[PDB]
Structures are given as structure tokens and as C-alpha cells.
Ligand binder design. Structure first.
Ligand SMILES: CC(=O)SCCNC(=O)CCNC(=O)[C@H](O)C(C)(C)COP(=O)(O)OP(=O)(O)OC[C@H]1O[C@@H](n2cnc3c(N)ncnc32)[C@H](O)[C@@H]1OP(=O)(O)O
Ligand SMILES: CC(=O)SCCNC(=O)CCNC(=O)[C@H](O)C(C)(C)COP(=O)(O)OP(=O)(O)OC[C@H]1O[C@@H](n2cnc3c(N)ncnc32)[C@H](O)[C@@H]1OP(=O)(O)O
Ligand SMILES: O=S(=O)(O)CCCN1CCN(CCO)CC1
Ligand SMILES: O=S(=O)(O)CCCN1CCN(CCO)CC1
Ligand SMILES: N[C@@H]1[C@@H](O)[C@@H](O)[C@@H](CO)O[C@@H]1O
Ligand SMILES: N[C@@H]1[C@@H](O)[C@@H](O)[C@@H](CO)O[C@@H]1O
Lengths: 316, 316
């Protein structure tokens, strides 16, 4: 057996699906979109028996800015790691993560994260990969809290419009709103979400995927919505193969801090969901939510669907 | 609004699917099979606005034996409770569970369990119903550990036959094995699993659904396997609508205590899965497993799929 770099995307995806495809079905389009467009220092290391790929790890160091966050070179990420089912418990996973980690460490990493990278596949260790928690524990990762993808079928429920206090308008974005939108993000969400707006517009997000809420003329919040016409495969629709015809998604969503807790997030969410409904969306997902916010979406009939555990290793 | 009994099965199932059908798709056949065949003292209470059902609770007291376990009349169960999404946070759930609980209590119940009943729909509080944990907490239930349904696609992986030490044979059950099987269960699994064998044979389980392992002539273990021809809808195939064509399942599985930890459970599991594979099964589920045993199935590529929290209220 040898460990060496591979960018044999088909073989990786094939191995991915054979091992975990029932619950994280992967396709080449998503795999390539996410791997190729990422701007971090990144690598894929494979484990090989001769010419046969038997496992891999994808890993990154935070070397590229997130909006007005500077990169923190101390942070590295394990995007994914899978050893083929017929080669488990032979130390291969170990050798792969050793190689990843030693490299990150030599280049200055001191905090190693399970998922949560830019162009992530996973917010953390999936519950479906719960037994890997012990693999990570043994290597010095500590297990922390959970995030959840939520699922709902917006074709099945009708909801009541929240009561519009006046001045506030919710609308699908137009090209000429881009200036205002960026101005709002620099103020309120100037980190990764800003960076995602910039990068997603570059990779095929369209104005139709964005809903804005304005007070008078000022942008004071947004959502990103997805359907089966969206060009960019974002996190809500990663696992669209599980979601049927007329799939969709939503996230992220935010309101200017000074307008919070007046029912405006609820209004934006309502309107975003009506747009999706009108687009004939059925099952749809809201990705990477925290526990404390689940009820916000649950009023609209969304339920936790997948769970992911945050996990972090501090380099000694 | 009024609370009163309802056996309007279609309306219940309709409400069930509108609220939680994306993740627990219910059909009338399963609902009726499970509700009607249960032998416990049982009731369904509905909440109504005039003629419209807006919520329900199904509840039971342990009044019927489990194999050679006597019923423990102190145990009651909340099989399920759902309030329609357009009527939440109006106290309806409260009034329903108050009515259920007061009745159980008057009839002698002192321990109240979330799911885990005979003919259960849920081993505990589903993770997809995680926000209800707080509903139950407020009423004095304590949250305990987790159980997991596991999922795998047996069409996608080939496995190695474990090394047969001699004497042990694994075979699909025949009618004439029924005596031996019961003899083995009275010895080794004489509680609910024995009772399930008796009752499932009465409701349409066939010898083809059972695999036995024998040493010489003695039955020393079993599994129950399911495919799309099984007549009895058991727990592994409750959520078959999520599982595609050629769905299947497995569970329970057991080995005589004196033969444990010699590789025989692994051999039985291997053979059971080969049978399913030969029956062209693809996605299949292993229901209600504990954390400590997940790896046993994970060697065969099964992964946690759903999680359920045990929860118990001790009556003051
Ligand atoms: C950010 C993310 O990628 S999260 C998702 C992680 N990936 C997955 O869950 C995919 C499916 N699983 C796998 O691919 C594998 O099981 C991996 C990658 C987790 C581990 O790969 P392997 O090559 O089997 O691990 P390796 O043989 O080095 O195991 C090292 C040690 O970790 C621990 N370990 C590994 N797997 C397990 C397990 N399933 N349960 C408990 N401990 C485990 C053990 O201590 C093991 O030593 P042992 O064999 O002496 O018991
Ligand atoms: C064994 C099993 O059946 S497990 C599955 C349980 N069922 C479900 O999860 C199905 C979907 N959910 C539902 O049907 C409902 O949300 C139910 C049945 C859990 C609760 O019904 P409701 O009629 O909304 O509850 P009710 O209004 O009596 O709530 C009472 C209190 O419980 C607590 N509570 C209820 N729902 C929630 C929630 N989603 N989050 C936090 N606390 C809650 C609150 O303290 C609430 O009081 P409040 O309204 O003053 O905050
Ligand atoms: O990164 S931004 O400053 O642009 C905004 C970040 C805000 N969200 C980050 C992720 N958490 C937790 C994930 O649900 C919620 C807040
Ligand atoms: O009830 S029997 O005596 O027939 C056998 C019970 C054995 N199993 C019961 C449920 N637990 C935990 C559920 O996974 C495993 C043991
Ligand atoms: N839900 C979003 C998720 O999509 C992602 O942008 C992430 C970034 O931290 O956190 C958010 O809350
Ligand atoms: N997996 C089984 C489950 O099907 C059920 O029979 C239950 C009874 O307690 O526990 C078992 O471990």
C-alpha cells in the first residue's frame, strides 16, 4: 500500500458512494464544483493498492480571506476521510490522517476541524458516521455540540402571512440591488456569508436565488433559496438525490441586528417559502442550523433531518 | 375544542403524514396492523374542532404478557402524539397528554415511557422530533440514552464468509423447526422476542422470514429478515416508503448466551444478509440498535440512519 495524491475524481466519488452513498449520495458535478472552486490551500491524499484506490482524505488550511475576515493560518480542516469498507481496521485511516495532519502542522496549523470548511461537504461529523467519533477521539479530537439539516415539504402545508408593520418589503433580488446588498453584508454579515455571496455569484448563483427584505430603500436582510433550476449546488441541495422531483432548499438567512426580534425574520422566511411553493418545490432542506434556532423553522413544519457533531483537535 | 376517542384511522394517518410524513411516512396498512393487533389496554384520544381532527395521542398500559414475562401494570406508554402544525402552542398537546396520563395513572401506572411499546412506531423520541423533548421535559419526563435504526445497501458490497468452525449450520427455517425454535427462545430470549415470534406468526410472518443457526440439531440462534414479499410489516420495514424498490430489513438477531463471542453472530448475520442479497434486496434497515452494537453491523456497511431518545416519566 502507498499513500499519494490523487485527483481521480471519478474513483473518489465511486468510493464515496459505495461506502456512504445511501445517506450522502455524491455526484461528480457537486464533488468537482466544491473541490475545484475552493480557494484554500487544499489537497487530496489517496491510499492505493497498486492501481486501486482504497481510501482518501481531503484537507485544507485557511489561507484565503472570508469577506472581511483575514485567513487564520492556524486553522486546518478535514473536509472528508473515507476508507473502503473491505479495508477497515488495518491502520489506513490512521496513515491518511497522519499524513494530512503532519503537513498542515508543518505549514503552521494548530487547530484541526472536522468539516465546517469552505465548500464543505459536512458541518461536522455526521451522525451516520457516529462510529468515526471514536476514531477521531483516539487521535485527540474533542467532541462538541451538534448542528442539524432540517427537512420539510412545503407543498403540504399552507401558512398565515405574519402581520406586516409597514415600511418593510420582501422581494427577489434584481441586478441593481447588488451594491445595496453588499453594503448591508459589510455591516451585518461581513465574514463568511459575504465571502459566499461574492464566490457564489462567480460560480452560477443568480439574482433569482436571493430574496431581500428592505425598509424603505435600505436592504436589512436576505435569504438564499434553491430549486431544481439553480445553477450553483449549495449546501441545502447537496443531498438532492434524497429529495425527489421538485426539490429545493433555503439558507442562509439573516436580518440586520438592529431589526431583530420584531417578526421580520419570520416575515422573510414566510415570503421565501411562498416563492418556493410558487415554484412548485416539494421537499426542501435548511442546512447547518443550531439547536436554539430549530423552532424558528419548525413553525413552518421543518424537522431535523441530519445531525453533525463539531469536533476539534488542538495540536500540542 | 373537544378531546374524545377516535378510531378514524384515515384521518389520523392523514394528519400523521401532513405533519411528519417526510421522515415517518405512514400508510393505513401499517397503522391498522400495529394498532388493531396490539393486545395491551389501548386507546386513541383525538382533539377536535367540531368535526375536524386537529391532534391525537395513542397510549397503552402493559396488561398482556410478553412471553414468560408477566405484564407489569405499572408501565404505561405514549405510542405517539401529534398536534397539527396549524394548531401548535395552544395547549392542545398538553390537554391530550394530561388525559392519557390521568387515565393510565387511575388504572395504576407509575412509569410512563415514550414509545418502546409492543407494536411501537418509535423506540423512543425521534431525533426528527427533537424539539418535543422539551415538551416532554416540561411534563416531568427525563431524557435518557439513544437507540438507532441503521441503513445499508446490500446490493453494493460483497463480503467474505467468516471461517466456519464445524458443527454449525445456518438455514432458513422450516415448519418442523417451530418446536425447536420455541424451545430455544424459552431458554435464551423468553421475554418480548418470544412473544413477538408467537404474535408475528399469527399476523403473517412466514418461515421464509426466519433464519436459524443450529449446532448439530440444536437451534442456537435466529434472525428475522424482511423483503418486499413479507406479509407482516415489522419494525425494519416500517419506513419502507423511504427505502425504494427491493427494500428489506433485518432484526432482531440473537445467539444462545453460551455460544456468544465465538464469531457465530457474525456468521448468522453474514448468511442472513446473503439470503437478502440473493433475494435482490437493495436498501435495508436494522431497527432499534444500541450504540455498543453498531460496529457489529457496521462491518457489513450499515450506518446509523435514525436516532431515538428513551424518555421516562416517574409518577409522583
Ligand atoms: C470529517 C469527516 O470526514 S467525518 C466522516 C468520517 N468518515 C466516515 O465515517 C466514513 C466511514 N468510515 C471510514 O471510512 C472508516 O471507519 C474511518 C475512516 C473512520 C476509519 O478508517 P480505518 O482505516 O478503519 O481506521 P484505522 O484502522 O486507522 O483505525 C484506527 C483506530 O481508530 C479507532 N476506530 C476506527 N474505527 C472505529 C470504529 N468504527 N469504532 C470504534 N473505534 C474505531 C480504533 O481504535 C482503531 O484501532 P483498532 O483497529 O486497533 O481498533
Ligand atoms: C412518543 C412520541 O410521540 S415522540 C414524538 C412527539 N411528537 C412530535 O414531535 C410531533 C410534532 N410535534 C407536535 O405534534 C407538537 O409540537 C407536540 C405534540 C410535541 C406539542 O404539542 P402542542 O399542542 O404544540 O404543545 P402545547 O401547546 O401543550 O405545549 C406545551 C408546552 O410544551 C413546551 N413545548 C411545546 N412545543 C415545544 C417546542 N417545539 N420547543 C420547546 N418547547 C415546547 C412549551 O413549554 C409549551 O408551552 P408554551 O407554548 O407556553 O411555550
Ligand atoms: O460569517 S458571517 O459573519 O458572515 C455570518 C455568520 C453567522 N452564522 C455563522 C454560523 N452560525 C452557526 C451555524 O448555524 C450561525 C451564525
Ligand atoms: O426480550 S427478550 O428477553 O426476548 C430479549 C430482549 C433482548 N434485547 C432487548 C432490547 N435490547 C436493546 C434494544 O437494542 C437489546 C436486547
Ligand atoms: N446555515 C448557515 C450555513 O449554510 C453556513 O453558511 C454556516 C457558515 O458558518 O453557518 C450558517 O448558519
Ligand atoms: N432490535 C430489537 C427491536 O426490534 C425490538 O425487538 C426491541 C425489543 O426490546 O429490542 C431489540 O434489540
Amino acid at each position: 500500500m502507498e499513500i499519494k495524491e490523487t485527483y481521480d475524481f471519478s474513483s473518489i466519488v465511486d468510493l464515496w458512494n459505495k461506502n456512504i452513498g445511501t445517506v450522502y449520495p455524491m455526484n461528480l458535478e457537486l464533488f468537482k464544483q466544491n473541490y475545484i472552486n475552493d480557494r484554500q490551500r487544499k489537497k487530496i491524499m489517496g491510499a492505493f493498492n497498486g492501481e486501486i484506490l482504497i481510501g482518501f482524505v481531503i484537507y485544507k488550511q485557511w489561507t484565503y480571506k472570508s469577506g472581511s475576515l483575514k485567513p487564520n493560518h492556524k486553522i486546518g480542516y478535514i473536509n472528508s476521510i473515507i476508507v473502503d469498507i473491505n479495508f477497515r481496521h488495518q491502520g489506513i485511516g490512521t496513515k491518511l490522517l497522519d499524513a494530512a495532519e503532519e503537513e498542515l502542522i508543518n505549514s503552521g496549523v494548530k487547530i484541526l476541524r472536522c468539516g465546517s470548511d469552505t465548500y464543505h461537504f459536512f458541518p461536522g461529523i455526521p451522525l451516520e458516521c457516529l462510529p468515526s467519533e471514536e476514531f477521531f477521539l483516539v487521535r485527540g479530537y474533542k467532541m462538541q455540540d451538534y448542528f442539524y439539516d432540517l427537512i420539510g415539504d412545503v407543498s403540504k402545508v399552507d401558512f398565515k402571512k405574519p402581520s406586516i408593520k409597514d415600511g418593510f418589503k420582501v422581494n427577489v433580488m434584481k441586478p441593481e440591488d447588488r451594491k445595496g446588498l453588499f453594503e448591508f453584508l459589510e455591516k451585518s454579515f461581513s465574514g463568511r456569508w459575504l465571502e459566499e455571496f461574492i464566490e457564489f455569484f462567480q460560480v452560477g448563483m443568480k439574482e433569482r436565488d436571493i430574496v431581500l427584505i428592505k425598509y424603505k430603500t435600505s436592504v436589512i436582510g436576505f435569504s438564499h433559496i434553491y430549486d431544481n433550476k439553480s445553477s450553483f449546488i449549495g449546501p441545502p441541495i447537496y443531498w438532492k438525490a434524497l429529495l425527489g422531483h421538485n426539490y429545493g432548499g433555503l439558507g442562509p438567512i439573516g436580518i440586520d441586528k438592529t431589526y431583530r426580534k420584531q417578526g421580520l425574520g419570520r416575515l422573510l422566511l414566510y415570503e421565501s417559502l411562498q416563492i418556493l411553493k410558487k415554484r412548485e418545490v416539494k421537499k426542501m432542506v435548511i442546512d447547518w442550523t443550531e439547536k436554539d434556532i430549530i423552532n424558528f423553522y419548525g413553525r413552518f413544519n421543518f424537522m431535523p433531518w441530519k445531525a453533525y457533531r463539531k469536533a476539534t483537535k488542538e495540536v500540542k
